[PDB]
Amino acid sequence: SEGDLDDLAQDLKDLYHTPSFLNFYPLGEDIDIIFNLKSTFTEPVLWRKDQHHHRVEQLTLNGLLQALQSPCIIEGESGKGKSTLLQRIAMLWGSGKCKALTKFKFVFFLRLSRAQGGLFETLCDQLLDIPGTIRKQTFMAMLLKLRQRVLFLLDGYNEFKPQNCPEIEALIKENHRFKNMVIVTTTTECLRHIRQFGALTAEVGDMTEDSAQALIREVLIKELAEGLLLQIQKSRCLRNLMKTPLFVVITCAIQMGESEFHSHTQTTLFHTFYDLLIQKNKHKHKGVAASDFIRSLDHCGDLALEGVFSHKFDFELQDVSSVNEDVLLTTGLLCKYTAQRFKPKYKFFHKSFQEYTAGRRLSSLLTSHEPEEVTKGNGYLQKMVSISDITSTYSSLLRYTCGSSVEATRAVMKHL
Amino acid sequence: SEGDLDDLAQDLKDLYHTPSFLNFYPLGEDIDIIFNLKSTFTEPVLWRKDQHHHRVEQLTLNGLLQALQSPCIIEGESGKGKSTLLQRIAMLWGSGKCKALTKFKFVFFLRLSRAQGGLFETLCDQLLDIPGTIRKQTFMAMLLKLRQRVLFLLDGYNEFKPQNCPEIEALIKENHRFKNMVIVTTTTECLRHIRQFGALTAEVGDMTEDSAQALIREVLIKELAEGLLLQIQKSRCLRNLMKTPLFVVITCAIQMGESEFHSHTQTTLFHTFYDLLIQKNKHKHKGVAASDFIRSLDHCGDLALEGVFSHKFDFELQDVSSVNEDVLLTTGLLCKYTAQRFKPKYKFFHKSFQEYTAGRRLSSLLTSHEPEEVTKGNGYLQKMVSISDITSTYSSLLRYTCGSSVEATRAVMKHL
């Protein structure tokens, strides 16, 4: 009952080097795009927020491990791409290169979105099939007796329900019963359910320029990579967008498969991104009437547009006045913040996204077959009678409105 | 067995150091504000009432412990925030720094608001699972055999029903059968059900200026804290208010989350406070018709207003003439006192609160769509015909009336 413990550790070390573990779909399974952890995002930015929930002390992987303590909670920036951090840790353990992991005997990488029946059943079924030599529930004695030399990496907390496996939900909240180390990843929306149980919290930030450039070089045709590299060197606004894991995977994705470099103006990127968000969560909108979803989007759109004219990006509940917007919070168009505030706040993923959103809505209104909708659109354009506004504050809005539609462009140019 | 007992004591000591014990919600769970006992209220004041129920002999934490005898009853102020005292004791025991607690082998921190099935089961389930090696009912034989070397810290007595766990109700009432030390925290309203069983009593008082200042500094943005500190130093009335934990936490809670310092006029502070009392207990007012609940609140409002004119702050039952006001006693607007007096008495949480309450009612009446209600409101204004009242006794009433409504302000200014 000892030799097989070493076999299990070795078997898991080798398992984490398997292609079925190292490969993932950055844009989701709907697009057959596969990234290999060995060459993709390798150097994440990890912020350790203070007691006031502010970003302080920027940390790195293999710098955070040395600060590892009882339960740690890592929050996704804002409902973005896959939090490819926990699997990096499993790889590093499997490699044995990082000294901070050499003090551990086991690493168990689990998806909370796919769990049920209890801890034992989940480990046996989801991970490596444990030999019957010691598979008699006595493994708990070893787990509890050995010490904090075991890492449980739990992903997708926000997609997990306690009724399916209350043992592991209890594990993360009541760790004093196990005396092991547990790290969980979540999203902003479900953070309020936890945190109160955490010893340490952290947030995943943007990637460095060197990392983003490596990604483009590593997963693309050399000739097309040079095109994108030249474009990003020449442009100035794109350089601010290429910090987001969601965009650095789209500009390439819409280029891959082609034999020639295309500029793919930002309007295209924003449109593509928008469509991906609404379609990505479409699979969960089957309970939403088409008229509810469309009207909700229109509501969000009008909010963004008024926000542009009102020069505001921060909204409160009274600025929404719609319970049905939980659909778009789910979609990821608007993020609800439940941080250390008296009241919750609503913000768009990015200010430029809000501007795009406003543009798309205005453009649609201006091209509507209904005179009233066009009139309302004109009502907004009619405010644009100052050179100091046209070339400044509303420059982005006009560009998005124009790029989004030829007829919208015509209305804008006539006005200008 | 002995090793298990030593480990059990250590396990509990460590349990009391977890974030799950150190983190709490000073304004309740629906609002995500989390305080850490390590930096928040650390130095409470404990008054030991005499046989005449007089406030005498100011005591302190770690000064009272040395005078701990058979069961102690600690009374809250008047239905305020969390009585974060018992958990501090558990922490101190867990730290092992206070000599008074070094004599104790076990500390058992329990919430009576969540208890049932018996003491044995409650301890195991609510605190820490006791190993099956000693968790054989004989635990109690050990516990009893030992001596008065353990502490049972029981919170939320007013939320405890004896039908759920009569063993604990017995634990607190019949102590010679248990031969251990028990400390219970209760409220004024349910004091009458006990007291007769107590050996020693204490009341939680207000915090010092140094503490309140510390609390502001510890849980708020530096820049915003500086703003509040300057405001507090400049004002005269706020300083008197900032003795009560309820207002101290709200004041910083509403400023917290903002990017800039705001004056937050005390009329806003009182409004927020008022609404919290009304809405927080709404969950337990579902058996009260909306007409009955509002009518009762209006009744309280009129009582406050008449009391202001009559200079009456001490109310009797005949001044209420409504059995249904138990809903407001529950709400916490009015506190019923059952001190050693010929008759029970009713009082507002604070004189300034009573004045504020009067303000709300008068302001509302003066803006009513019903001429009779406006007339009644005016009838009160018609008494303000002497400068000696205008700039004195009713100054706060006029200020509250104004702050509460623009239309009310207009009526007031026309009068003045």
**Residue A177 and residue B19: Cβ atoms within 8 Å?**
no
SS3 track for chain A: CCHHHHHHHHHHHHHCCCHHHHEECCCCCCCCCCEECCCCCCCCEEECCCCCCCCCCEEECCCCHHHCCCCEEEECCCCCCCCCCHHHHHHHHHHCCCHHHCCCCEEEEEECCCCCCCHHHHHHHHCCCCCCCCCCCCHHHHHHHHCCCEEEEEECHHHCCCCCCHHHHHHHHCHHHCCCEEEEEECCCCHHHCCCCCCEEEEECCCCHHHHHHHHHHCCCHHHHHHHHHHHHHCCCHHHHCCCCCCCCHHHHCCECECCCCCCCHHHHHHHHHHHHHHHCHHHCCCCCHHHHHHHHHHHHHHHHHHHHCCCCCECHHHCCCHHHHHHHHHCCEEEECCCCCCCEEEECCHHHHHHHHHHHHHHHHCCCCHHHHHHHHHHHCCCCCHHHHHHHCHHHHHHHHHHCHHHHHHHHHHC
Asked if A407 is an interface residue toward chain B (Cβ–Cβ < 8 A), one would say: no
DSSP string, B17-77: TSHHHHEE-TT-SSS---EETTTSS---EEE---TT----SEEETTTSGGG--S-EEEE-S
What gap in Å lies between CA B124 and CA B146, rounded to an integer?
19
Structure tokens at A8: 């299990």
Pairing mode, strands B58-60 and B150-155: unpaired
Best CA proximity match to B89, nearest among B70, B66, B56, B57 = B66
User: B167 in helix, strand or coil?
Assistant: helix
- Reduced to 3 states, what is the DSSP secondary structure of residue B109? strand
Chain B environment of A196 (Cβ under 8 Å): 19-20, 23, 25, 34
**Contact pairs from chain A to chain B, CB under 8 Å:** 53
Instruction: List the determination method.
Output: cryo-EM
3-state secondary structure of B81: coil
Instruction: Show residues of chain B in contact with A175, CB under 8 Å.
Output: 18
H/E element, B111: strand B106-111
Which segments within B133-263 are labelled E, that is strand?
A: 150-155, 181-186, 200-204
DSSP assignment string, B366-394: HT-SSHHHHHHHHHHHTT---HHIIIIIT
Q: Do B34 and A177 touch (CB under 8 A)?
A: no
Task: Taking the CA atoms of A19, A20, A24 and A29 in sequence, report the sign of the dihedral they define.
Answer: positive
Q: How far is CA B160 from CA A354, B155, B185, B205, in A?
A: 51, 9, 11, 24
Let me know how long chain B is.
416
**Number of other residues whose CB lies within 10 A of the CB of residue B312:** 14
Could you give phi then psi for residue B107, rounded to 5 degrees? -130, 130
Q: Which of A363, A392, A389 is nearest to A378 (CA)?
A: A363
Asked if B18 lies within 8 A of A339 by C-beta distance, the reply is no
| Residue (of A319, A228, A201, A246) closest to A78 by Cα position | A246
Indicate the DSSP class of residue B106: E
Residue B355 one-letter amino acid = E
CA angle (B209 as vertex; B205, B211 as ends), nearest 5:
75
3-class DSSP state of B174: coil
Report the candidate in A151, A72, A78, A155 with the shortest Cα–Cα distance to residue A111. Answer: A155
Q: What is the sign, positive or negative, of the torsion defined by CA atoms of B296, B302, B305, B307?
A: negative
- Cα A29 from Cα B117, distance rounded (Å): 50
Phi-psi region of A383 (alpha: psi -120 to 50; beta: other; left: phi over 0): alpha
Distance in angstroms (rounded) separating the CA atoms of residues B262 and B265: 9
Closest to B319 in 3D by CA, of B331, B330, B306? B306
List C-alpha distances in Å: B152 to A272, A295, B127.
Answer: 62, 58, 12
Angle, alpha carbons B163-B167-B173 (nearest 5°)? 95
- Residues that constitute the known binding site of B for ATP: 76-83
Which amino acid is it at B155? D
Element spanning B87, H or E: helix B86-95
Query: How far, in Å, CA of A303 to CA of B309, rounded?
Result: 49
Residues A303, A320 contacting (CB under 8 angstroms):
yes
Q: Residue-wise over A260-273: b if at least 16 C-beta within 10 A, else e?
A: ebeebebbebbbbb
The span from the CA of A252 to the CA of A244, in Å, is 13
Q: Which residue of A174, A195, A342 is in closest CB contact with B254?
A: A342
What is the C-alpha separation between B155 and B160, in angstroms, rounded?
A: 9
Report d(CA B355, CA A216) in Å as an integer. 68
| Partner residues linked to B335 by β-bridges | B347
Torsion of Cα atoms, A339 then A340 then A343 then A348, to 10°: -30
Please say whether the beta carbons of B363 and B405 come within 8 A: yes
Chain A residues in contact with B214 (beta carbon < 8 A): none
- The DSSP 8-state label assigned to residue B348 in this structure reads E
SS3 category, B272: helix
Region for B80 from its dihedrals, namely left if φ exceeds 0, alpha if ψ lies in -120 to 50, beta otherwise: beta
Length of chain A as a residue count: 416
Residues in CB range of B54: below 8 A, 6 or more apart: none
Contact B393, B352 (CB under 8 A): no
Contacting residues for B7 by C-beta, under 8 A, at least 6 apart: none
C-alpha B336/C-alpha A219 separation (Å) is 73
Residue B256's CB is within 10 A of a number of other CB atoms, namely 20
Q: Is A188 on the interface with B (CB under 8 A)?
A: no
**A1 among the known binding-site residues?**
no
Q: Nearest CB to A197: which of B15, B20, B221?
A: B20
Task: Find the helix or strand (DSSP H, E) in which B398 lies.
Answer: helix B395-404
Chain B positions touching A338 (Cβ under 8 A) are: 32
Whether the CB of A195 is below 8 Å from some CB of chain B: the reply is yes
Let me know: does A342 contact B257? Beta carbons within 8 Å: yes
Count Cβ atoms below 10 Å from residue B292 Cβ, excluding itself. 13
CA gap B48, B22 in Å, rounded: 27
Q: Which of B118, B23, B7, B119 is nearest to A173 (CA)?
A: B23
Pairwise CA distance, residues B16 & B27, whole Å: 22
| Spatial contact of B256 and A340, defined as CB atoms under 8 Å apart | yes
Other residues' Cβ atoms within 10 Å of the Cβ of residue A221: 15
The answer to whether A77 and A204 have CB atoms below 8 angstroms apart is yes
**CB of A343 less than 8 A from some CB of B:** yes
- B317 contact A CB<8A: no
Q: Do the Cβ atoms of B39 and A51 come within 8 Å?
A: yes
**Buried b or exposed e, range B119-136, using 16+ CB within 10 angstroms:** bbebbeeebbebeeebbe
Give the position of tokens 């809250």.
B76
Cα–Cα distance list, B92 to A29, B23, B86, B95, B148 (Å): 53, 15, 10, 5, 19
Q: Is B416 helix (H, G, I), strand (E, B) or coil?
A: coil
Nearest to A87, CA basis, from A99, A103, A74: A74
Q: Which residue has the tokens 């460590």?
A: B14
Among candidate residues A206, A228, A233, A207, the one with its CA nearest the CA of residue A216: A228
Q: Do A174 and B20 touch (CB under 8 A)?
A: yes
Return the structure tokens found at A359. Answer: 């543009």
Q: Which long-range contacts (CB under 8 A, 24 or more apart) does A65-68 make?
A: A65/A89, A65/A98, A65/A100, A65/A101, A66/A100, A67/A200, A68/A100, A68/A181, A68/A183, A68/A200
CB B203 within 8 A of CB B75: yes
Q: Is A83 annotated as a binding residue?
A: yes
- Closest of A122, A34, A123 to residue A84, by C-alpha: A34
CA distance B106 to A97: 44
Best of A338, A341, A343, A347 to substitute, by most chain B Cβ atoms within 10 angstroms, is A341
Report the alpha-carbon distance of residue B229 to residue A131 in Å, rounded.
65
The rounded distance, in Å, linking the Cα atoms of A77 and B15 is 31
Nearest Cα neighbor of A248 from A238, A235, A263 is: A238
Element (H, E) at B279: helix B266-280
- The Cα B67–Cα B197 span in angstroms is 17
Tokens of A79: 């409902």
Q: Minimal Cα distance from B128: which residue of A?
A: A177
